[PDB]
Design a protein around this ligand. Structure first.
Ligand code: NAG
Ligand code: NAG
Ligand code: NAG
Ligand code: NAG
Ligand code: NAG
Ligand code: NAG
Ligand code: NAG
Ligand code: NAG
Ligand code: NAG
Lengths: 484, 484, 484
C-alpha cells in the first residue's frame, strides 16, 4: 500500500568543519595533515656519504679527521653535530657561501697544481694536527724559513686552469702570536701576500697579537678561497707567512645536503628530509617541521583538518537530508540510498545501485584531486648548527613566517569549501531519486510529506520490484487507481 | 479565498559586488575594511619609554642627552624624529644591525669592566659633550698622553665574560684632523688597535685628514661593537688613539620598538602601531598604513569592500526573489518572510518565525568566521628616519609590494564569493517556504504563478491560522474542495 | 498533440577541466594563457636609447665607445650583449648597486667641477683608449709627475654641491705593474688617497704586482663612487696614483631599463618587455618568460588553461542537461534553448530569446571579470649578462620560484571553479524554462519524462504560438481538456 525511501546512517559519526557551521557530524571522514615521521634517513637508491666528525669544509683542506673524505662522491650528504673543519685553530672567510656550493656539488675532484720550492723549508708541522706524530693539513704546505732568523726570499708562483669546470682554490694566511716569534719563523720587515687573478687583487697582511688559547695554540690560520674560470690564471707573490695549497678542487654533479641527527636507513625509501627523520606520506599538508628539504608536503599551522567522504549523519541546501526525510536508517548496510516498501505481503528493504554509485564516483574524484605530488624541490638556505649573519637571517625568518601564514589559510579554506560541497552533493542525489520515483508513478499515488509514497492499488512484491528497476508501466494500472 | 506569501524590502538599499554582477542592491550591508585610526599611542598595560632627544644608540655610549636612559627597562620603545646618537661628531659601523637587537631587548643592564690606567692621562674632554662644563661620553674613556709630545706607552688590557647572557661591548677609534695634532695628543709612529676575541681579529688604524666642520669639530670617532658569549674574553692592545669602554651591556627580555610622531596615551588600549597612531578594530583588512607592526589586520589596496548581510532588495539561482514573486513588501516589518491572506473576513499579514530565524542564523555564522584575529606578530625590519642600504632596501620593497598584491586579491575574491552565496541562501529559504505550504495544502488549492495559492473552500481567520502554524488537516476539507 | 523542448549541440566540442571531472566536453571554450610573443621591442610613444657597444657604466666615465651617450635622455634604456664599460683594463666596485640607479634615472646631466693643477703633468694617455691617436677617458684626468723620477707634491682639492639633486662622483685608483714603474711615474714613499665627505673616510692605497695581460696592459684602474647630498662637500688629498674626475653627474627623471637581444620597433606598442621581445595580450596569465619587466601578466607553470563559454555538449547538478533531457539538437542554430512542437499541422522548431539572452549575459559577465589589467609595475633586480653575488642571488631565485608556485595554484583553481559554475549555470536555465511552461499549462497537459508535454486538445500552430510568447490562456481550454 505504500513505498518509502531513505538513506543510511551510523551511530558514531565524525565532526568536520564546513563553510557555514562548526562541528558537523558526517558518516565518514579523512585526515589530510601528516603528523607522524619515520625517525631515520630513508635512502634506497641514493648513494650516501655520512660525514660524522669530518666537517663539510674539511674535504678541501684535509684535517686528520677527513682523510677518507678528500675525494668523495655521493648524492646525499649528511652532516652531523660534531663536525669540525680545522685542526690548527682558525676559521674560514665567507664560510656559508662556500657550504652552499659543496652541498649541491655531488662530490669533489682534486687535481695537483705543481709548485716547486727551493732555498726554503716546507715541512713545518704543528702539534695539533696529529696523524702518527706531528703533521699539518693534507693538501697545503707550511712555507717557512730555513735559518731560524736570517731571511726569507721573496717568491712568486703561478697556476693556470686547463679544464672546463670551475676550480676551487684555497690558501691560508698565518697570524703569529707576536713579532718575536714571527721573526723566529720568517725574517723581518712587512709581510705582503698579493693574490692576483683576472678578477681578484687583495694583498692580505698578517696581524700578530695575543689571543686566548684555543686547544693549546695562540696563533690563527685564516683560509680564503676564490673560483677560477677556464683558461684563467692565479699568481701568489709573498715574502713570508703563507700557507700554500698543493691541489685544486672541482665539482662532479648534482646532489642535496641535509643536516640530521638520526641514523641512515638503507631499506626504507623517502624523499622528504628534515633534521629528525623522513616525512613519508601522500597527504598535501604536514605539521612536523617547517625546515624540511626535498620534495615535501607544505607546512601548515593547524594540526588536524578532516575531509568529509560521506553524507551527513542523521541517526534515529536541497532539503532532503534532514529536510522532509527526518532520519537515517541503520539497517541499510548495502549502499547509501534505498527503498522500503510495506504491503499485504509484509515488508522488505532494498538498496539502489545507480544512485549510490553516482555519489561515490564524485567523492573519489575529489580525493584523487587533493592527493597529489609537489614537483618543486626546495634546497637548504640557512644553517642550523652555526648561525648565519644576523641581518640576512632576519629576512629568511620573515619570509618563511609569511609563506606559512598563506598556506595555512589556503588549507582551511579548501577543506571548509570541500565539505560544504560534499554535503550538498549527497543531498541532491536524494532529491533526484525522490523525483524520479515521483514522475514515474504518475497519477497512481500521492505524497505523504515524509518522503514516502502511498499507492492506490494492490501492488505486491513482484509489482514493487517494477518500481525499483525503473520498469513500472502506469498505463496498466491507470483505470483502476483513479477510482481512489 | 486565497493565501499569498512574500518577503520584506526597504526603499534605500546598498550596492555590493557579487561574483557575476557589479552593484547589486541588497537590504543591508557591512563594511569590512578599516580606514579610521586613533592618532595616539595606546599603551594600557605596557610600561613605555619615550626616548625623545635620546637616540636608540645613545643608551650604550651615553651622550649628555641620554643620562636618564642608560639602564632603562620597558616593553614599548618609542623613537622620535630628533633622536641623535652622538655628541662628538662621528657615527657607528653596522648601525642598523645593532638597532634591531636593542628594540626587542626590553631594556639594558650595564656592568663594569674594571680597567686601571697608569702613566697616562684619561680625563681628556671635548667642548661638544657639555653637561656642566666640558665632558665626554658617560661610559667611555678618552685615553691620551701625559706629556704633550713625548711618548705613549704600548698598553694591553683584558676582560672576561662571567654571566650567562651575551654582552655588548663598544669601543671607539679616533681620527684626528692632521698628523700635527695627532702628535700633539699621542706621540709618533704608526698606531695600531688590535681587538682580539675568540672570533675577532681586525687591527684597526686611524686616518687623519681634513674634514668639513660638523658642529665645530673636524675630527671623528667611529664606534665599533662585538658580542661576547659566556666564558669568552676580549683583549685590547694599542699604542695610541683609542677610546676605551668602561661598562658592558646586557639584555633583559622581550619588547617591541615603534617609530612614531604622535603622543602617548595611557588610557586607550591597542596592539597595532604605525607611525601615525593606533589601528584599533576587529575587521580583517585595513587601508591605513602598510608598515604597521604588532598584531595588525592585513593591508589591502581597495578602500571599500561591502559584505551583504541581508537578502536582495526588490522594492515595489532558485527563482523566487525576483523570480515568480516579483516584488517585496514594505509593510512587513516583523521578520524576513511572511503570509498575507485575503478572504471574506478581510485581510491580514503575518510573519514566519521558523524561516526568518533559519536565514539569520546562517548569515551570523559567516560574520563570526570573517571577524577573527591574526596571531602572527610582525616586527620592524626597515628604518624610516635614516635610510637602510640600497641593494637590500630594494629587496624589502619588492617583497612587501608582492604580498600586498596577493592579499588584495584574496580580499575581493572572498567578498564577491561571500555575497554570491548569501543572495542564493535567502533565495532558497523562500523556495522551501513555498513548497512546504504547497504539499501541506495537498489537493485543496491550485497555484497562481505569482507565488500565491487559491483555496477552494471557505477558510476564515481561524482556518488560515491552521496553515501558518503547520497544523492544516486536509482530510476534513477534502470531500468538499474536490467539488471545485 | 505534444510540445517538446531541448538545447543546442555541436559535433566537435572542447575538453575543459572542472572541479570534479577531467576532460568535460563543452560547446565552446577560450584559452586564458598567453604563449606567443612579438620578437621585437615595441616602443611607440617612448623615447628610446639603444646603447649597443656602450656599457651602462660608460656613460659616467666616457670610454671612446660612449662618446654620443655621455648626456643621454630617454624613457626606455636597452642594453646589449657586447656592452663594455672600460677601455683601460679594470672594473668598478659595487657595480650592481650603481646599475640599478642608472636604469631608473631617465638620463644623466653632467656639470663641471673645476679643478686646476699646477707643477704636474695631466695629459698622460694610454694606448688602449684610442679615439684618433692615444687618449684616456673622456671625463677624468690621469695625474702624474712632471720629472720621470724626482717628486710628486702632495695635493688637496675640494668640491661643493650647489644643486638640489644628488650627485654621482666617480674617481679612480691606479695599481701599477710593479714598484719599478710606480717610481717611473710618480715618485717614492707610500701612497695615500684620502677621500673625505660628511659620510665617507676610506683612505685607499695602490697595490702593485704582476697580473695577466688583459688586452695588452698589466695594470688596473679600480673605479669607486659616492653620492653627494645638497650643500655637502668632498675633499681629495693625495701624494700620487690618482685618477681625478672632471665632471659630476645628476639625474633627470623616471624610466625603465631592459636587457634585450632583439631589434627596436617604432610602430608597435606594448608595455611588457622580456629579453626576447614583447608580450602583448589581454590574458591574465602567460607562459613565455618569468623574468619580464613592466606591466605584465603573471607567470604560470601550466601551458594551457581553457575556460568554458558555453553549455555542456551532449550530442546525438539540476538534472536537465543529460538529466531527463537526454540529447541536444543539432538543427537548432538560432539560440541556445528552444521549442519543437508536433501536431496535425506538422512540425516546427523555434528558439527562445529570453532564456538564451539570460545565459549569455552571465557568461560575458565572467569574461569581463577575468580579462583585466595589472596596475603593478615590476622592475629588474637581477642581471642576466653578468652574475650578481652568489648568496643574495640564491635568495632571489628562492623567492621567485615560490611566487610562481602560488600563482600557478590560483590559476587552475580559478578556472576549475569557473567551469564548474558555468556548466551548472546553463543547467539551471533549462530547468527554469521547463517549469515556466509547466505551471503555465496548468491542468491541460501531463508530463512524459523526456522533457516534453502532451496537450489534451487540438492546439494548432496559432495555438502553439500562444505558449512560446507566454500568452496561453488555460481558462478557455479548461472545460474541454478535463474530458481526457
Ligand atoms: C572511511 O574512511 C576511511 C579513510 O579515513 C577509510 O579507510 C574507510 O575504508 C572508510 N569506510 C569505513 C566504513 O570506515
Ligand atoms: C630564525 O628563526 C629560528 C627559529 O627556527 C631561530 O632559531 C633563529 O635564531 C632565527 N634567526 C634570527 C636571526 O632571528
Ligand atoms: C526488473 O529489472 C530486471 C533487470 O533489468 C529484470 O531482470 C526483471 O525482470 C525486471 N522486473 C521485475 C519484476 O523484477
Ligand atoms: C544592518 O547592518 C549594520 C552593520 O553595518 C548593523 O549595524 C545594523 O543593525 C543592521 N540592521 C539595520 C536595520 O540597519
Ligand atoms: C622603499 O619604499 C619606500 C616607500 O615607503 C621608499 O620611501 C624607499 O625610498 C624605498 N627604498 C628603496 C631602496 O627604493
Ligand atoms: C496553531 O499553533 C499554536 C501553537 O502551536 C496553537 O496554540 C494553536 O492552537 C494552533 N491553532 C490555531 C488555529 O491557531
Ligand atoms: C567561441 O569562442 C571563441 C573564443 O575562443 C570565439 O572567438 C567564438 O566567436 C565563439 N563562438 C563560436 C561559434 O566559435
Ligand atoms: C638563478 O636562476 C637562474 C635561472 O634563470 C640561473 O641562471 C642563475 O644561475 C641562478 N642563480 C644562482 C645564484 O643560483
Ligand atoms: C504572441 O506575442 C507576440 C508579441 O508579444 C504578439 O505579437 C502575438 O500576437 C502573440 N500571439 C500569437 C498567437 O502569436
Amino acid at each position: 500500500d505504500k513505498i518509502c525511501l531513505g538513506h543510511h546512517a551510523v551511530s558514531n559519526g565524525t565532526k568536520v568543519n564546513t563553510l557555514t557551521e562548526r562541528g558537523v557530524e558526517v558518516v565518514n571522514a579523512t585526515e589530510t595533515v601528516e603528523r607522524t615521521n619515520t625517525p631515520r634517513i630513508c635512502s634506497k637508491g641514493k648513494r650516501t656519504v655520512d660525514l660524522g666528525q669530518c666537517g663539510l669544509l674539511g674535504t678541501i683542506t684535509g684535517p686528520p679527521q677527513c682523510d677518507q673524505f678528500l675525494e668523495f662522491s655521493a648524492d646525499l650528504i649528511i652532516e652531523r653535530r660534531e663536525g669540525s673543519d680545522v685542526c690548527y685553530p682558525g676559521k674560514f672567510v665567507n664560510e656559508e657561501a662556500l657550504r652552499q656550493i659543496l652541498r649541491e656539488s655531488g662530490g669533489i675532484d682534486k687535481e695537483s697544481m705543481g709548485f716547486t720550492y727551493n732555498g726554503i723549508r716546507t715541512n713545518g708541522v704543528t702539534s695539533a694536527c696529529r696523524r702518527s706524530g706531528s703533521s699539518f693539513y693534507a693538501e697545503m704546505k707550511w712555507l717557512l724559513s730555513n735559518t731560524d732568523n736570517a731571511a726569507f726570499p721573496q717568491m712568486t708562483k703561478s697556476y693556470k686552469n686547463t679544464r672546463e669546470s670551475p676550480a676551487i682554490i684555497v690558501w691560508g694566511i698565518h697570524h703569529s702570536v707576536s713579532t718575536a716569534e714571527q721573526t723566529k719563523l720568517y725574517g723581518s720587515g712587512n709581510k705582503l701576500v698579493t693574490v692576483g687573478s683576472s678578477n681578484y687583487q687583495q694583498s692580505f697582511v698578517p696581524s700578530p697579537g695575543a689571543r686566548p688559547q684555543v686547544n693549546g695554540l695562540s696563533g690563527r690560520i685564516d683560509f680564503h678561497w676564490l673560483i677560477l674560470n677556464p683558461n684563467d690564471t692565479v699568481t701568489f707573490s709573498f715574502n713570508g707567512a703563507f700557507i700554500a695549497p698543493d691541489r685544486a678542487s672541482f665539482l662532479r654533479g648534482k646532489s642535496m645536503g641535509i643536516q640530521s641527527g638520526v641514523q641512515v636507513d638503507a631499506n626504507c625509501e623517502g624523499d622528504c628530509y628534515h633534521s629528525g627523520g623522513t616525512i613519508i606520506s601522500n597527504l598535501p599538508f604536514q605539521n612536523i617541521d617547517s625546515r624540511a628539504v626535498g620534495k615535501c608536503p607544505r607546512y601548515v599551522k593547524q594540526r588536524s583538518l578532516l575531509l568529509a567522504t560521506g553524507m551527513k549523519n542523521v541517526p534515529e541546501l536541497f532539503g532532503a537530508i534532514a529536510g522532509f526525510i527526518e532520519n537515517g536508517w541503520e539497517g541499510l548496510i548495502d549502499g547509501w540510498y534505498g527503498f522500503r516498501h510495506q504491503n499485504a505481503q509484509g515488508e522488505g528493504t532494498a538498496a539502489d545501485y545507480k544512485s549510490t554509485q553516482s555519489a561515490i564516483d564524485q567523492i573519489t574524484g575529489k580525493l584523487n584531486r587533493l592527493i597529489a605530488k609537489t614537483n618543486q624541490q626546495f634546497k637548504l638556505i640557512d644553517n642550523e648548527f652555526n648561525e648565519v649573519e644576523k641581518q640576512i637571517g632576519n629576512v629568511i625568518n620573515w619570509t618563511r613566517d609569511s609563506i606559512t601564514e598563506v598556506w595555512s589559510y589556503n588549507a582551511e579554506l579548501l577543506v571548509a569549501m570541500e565539505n560544504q560541497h560534499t554535503i550538498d552533493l549527497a543531498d541532491s542525489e536524494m532529491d533526484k531519486l525522490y523525483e524520479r520515483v515521483k514522475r514515474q508513478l504518475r497519477e497512481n499515488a500521492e505524497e505523504d510529506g515524509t518522503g514516502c509514497f502511498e499507492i492506490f492499488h494492490k501492488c505486491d512484491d513482484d509489482c514493487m520490484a517494477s518500481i525499483r528497476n525503473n520498469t513500472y508501466d502506469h498505463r496498466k494500472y491507470r483505470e483502476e487507481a483513479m477510482q481512489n
